[PDB]
Amino acid sequence: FIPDHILRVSVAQVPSACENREDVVVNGTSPGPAIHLLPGARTWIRVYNDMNDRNLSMHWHGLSQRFAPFSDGTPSATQWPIPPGHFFDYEILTEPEDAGTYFYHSHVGMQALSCTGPLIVEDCGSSPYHYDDERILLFQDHFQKSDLEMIQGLTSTQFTWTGETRGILLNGRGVSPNQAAVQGRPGEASGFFGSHRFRGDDQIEPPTDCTLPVIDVEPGKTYRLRFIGATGLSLLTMGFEDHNDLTIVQVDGSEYNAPVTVDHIQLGGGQRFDVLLRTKTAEELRCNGDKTTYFLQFETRDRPDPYRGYGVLRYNLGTPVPAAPTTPALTLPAEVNNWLEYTFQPLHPSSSLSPTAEEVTRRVILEAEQKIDPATGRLVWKLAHMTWTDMSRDKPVLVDIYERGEAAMPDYAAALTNYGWDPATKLFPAKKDEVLEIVIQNTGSHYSGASGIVETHPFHAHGQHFYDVGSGPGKYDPEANNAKLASLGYRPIKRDTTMVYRYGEGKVAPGEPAGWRAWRMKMNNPGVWMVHCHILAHMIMGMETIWVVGDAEDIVTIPLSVSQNYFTYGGSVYGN
Ligand SMILES: *[C@@H]1O[C@H](CO)[C@@H](O[C@@H]2O[C@H](CO)[C@@H](O)[C@H](O)[C@H]2NC(C)=O)[C@H](O)[C@H]1NC(C)=O
Ligand SMILES: *[C@@H]1O[C@H](CO)[C@@H](O)[C@H](O)[C@H]1NC(C)=O
Ligand SMILES: [Cu+2]
Ligand SMILES: [Cu+2]
Ligand SMILES: [Cu+2]
Ligand SMILES: [Cu+2]
């Protein structure tokens, strides 16, 4: 057995926002190298844990893994953690229509801050759009505190928050608020990340100085820009100086949307947008005084301490990379919660039909509640009056199901009378082909120290993508939303990550409903699928749910193509 691709994960001192950070890196860099997959293929990726005293898993964000649930890479859900000095063979099955932008990252603790890289399913000459080339734009947060310090604070009976982001990286380069970019030498600066111009372009070069991230383009071309929200905390809003025509053509990987023209991108943790950019002609550059550099300006939204950073859209490798401008290049809207809502529709509406209101047979509301956990004294994020951590159980759910079958499954009847989760197992069961509406209901915090506060959360589903059927302030009202969808003739798109926003001042009475997001999905993919806030600190604090779709007969008949070490913690898991 030889795997098709290999990723080696280690701890290394790397450049992070013009500082040094002891990061969990892939193949020596943060972000890690781009992996390119074919649609309609089986591809094996061996992940080595070369760390001394930390566990690892690798999650393939946005890939449903419908035929390889044991390859989802989710500790407590689909596998034992990969131990130090061992590996795990991941079977990636791409369906023919999976062409799109995804990303891989650790699903252990806060490793995903740094242990993250692009995962591209190639069109193979099948994109319904022309473009001369592509660029990957992968965004990360920089924290000055270590992963261990942040986890200890989050899990302490004297709660210490991580603090706000200390920098935004684009393809491994950016600037902490304590540092300042200076002019970079002309020539290559990883400005071609994701380019097909030639593999060299599949892995960033770490910066050697404090210099701005660069996207290198030629005049008068069209680029497919693959925006990847690999931030562990930040919701970003961003735009390009004097470039106002961005066309979004794909959302969260698979889904071709009818083209939407925007002047800025908003990008939360776990989201991807494929955007066509038409670059200025040599004549238009001549008329801006032979200007060859334009600022990309990116800002955090919806958090207490604003942050602004820059990258450079560069038209000529002969131009030195400029420092950040003394005053802002452009103005990004203060508001985020009404950007392209009830907007994206399928390009081919025929082959992407959202479940109708009539077809929904059950609704599960996940009320997001911050409060002290009485049993532990920890500050936690509850969903539907429960909490879930990657230490909620010893034996991972899917391992238990493959070992015992029916006896490991959650109790459906008990879950229906307890907010959708089984009192005995804290799992959310769904029948195969059950048509669900899932609502995330935001609320004012019960925590003294944040009383009545509402936060914005990027909500992500593992496995099958859902249809986004809307959002709004206050309490979800299904009768009103159904009336809204019908009045608009709205044709929803499939997504795997949507924001649950704060509205207005973001402060209500403790426990008062204060913003919602609604999903619909016909649950077609048996297995064990996490649904969670994609902010790493909120996951540490328990903002996760585990969904078990189907009966044991629907899961155990999916062939387990890995060795017997899958069943126990301590050994390498190899493919077959
Ligand atoms: C790696 O993960 C394993 C498996 O979850 C961890 O070991 C478990 O550790 C908990 C907490 O100490 C114990 O209650 C269990 O006895 C352990 N389970 C098994 C199967 O051994 C281990 O702590 C993790 N290692 C690191 C570095 O976090
Ligand atoms: C990562 O590095 C290993 C050797 O350390 C190599 O064998 C593997 O091919 C590299 N993977 C990628 C995608 O570059
Ligand atoms: Cu993810
Ligand atoms: Cu995911
Ligand atoms: Cu959250
Ligand atoms: Cu996840």
Author numbering: 11 to 208, 225 to 602
Extract from the study:
Multicopper oxidases are promiscuous biocatalysts with great potential for the production of industrial compounds. An electron extracted from the oxidized molecule in the T1 site is shuttled through a sequence of three highly conserved amino acids (the HCH bridge) to the TNC, where reduction of a dioxygen molecule to water occurs.
A disulfide bond is formed between Cys28 and Cys236, stabilizing the relative orientation of domains A and B. In accordance with the bioinformatic analysis, the crystal structure revealed two N-glycosylation sites, including Asn37 [one N-acetylglucosamine (NAG) molecule] and Asn65 (two NAG molecules). In the T1 site, the copper ion is coordinated by the ND1 atoms of His564 (2.1 Å distance) and His483 (2.0 Å distance) and by the thiolate group of Cys559 (2.2 Å distance), forming a trigonal plane. Also, a methionine residue (Met569) is positioned axially to the T1 copper at a distance of 3.15 Å. A dioxygen molecule is modelled between the T3a and T3b coppers rather than a water molecule or a hydroxyl anion, since it fits more accurately into the ellipsoid shape of the electron density, while the peaks in the difference electron-density map disappear. The presence of a dioxygen molecule between the T3 coppers corresponds to the fully reduced state of the enzyme according to Polyakov et al.. The linear coordination of the T2 copper by the N atoms of His69 and His486 is a strong indication that the T2 copper is present in the reduced state. Furthermore, since the last 20 amino acids of TtLMCO1 were not included in the final structure due to a lack of electron density, there is no indication that the C-terminus of TtLMCO1 penetrates the T3 tunnel.
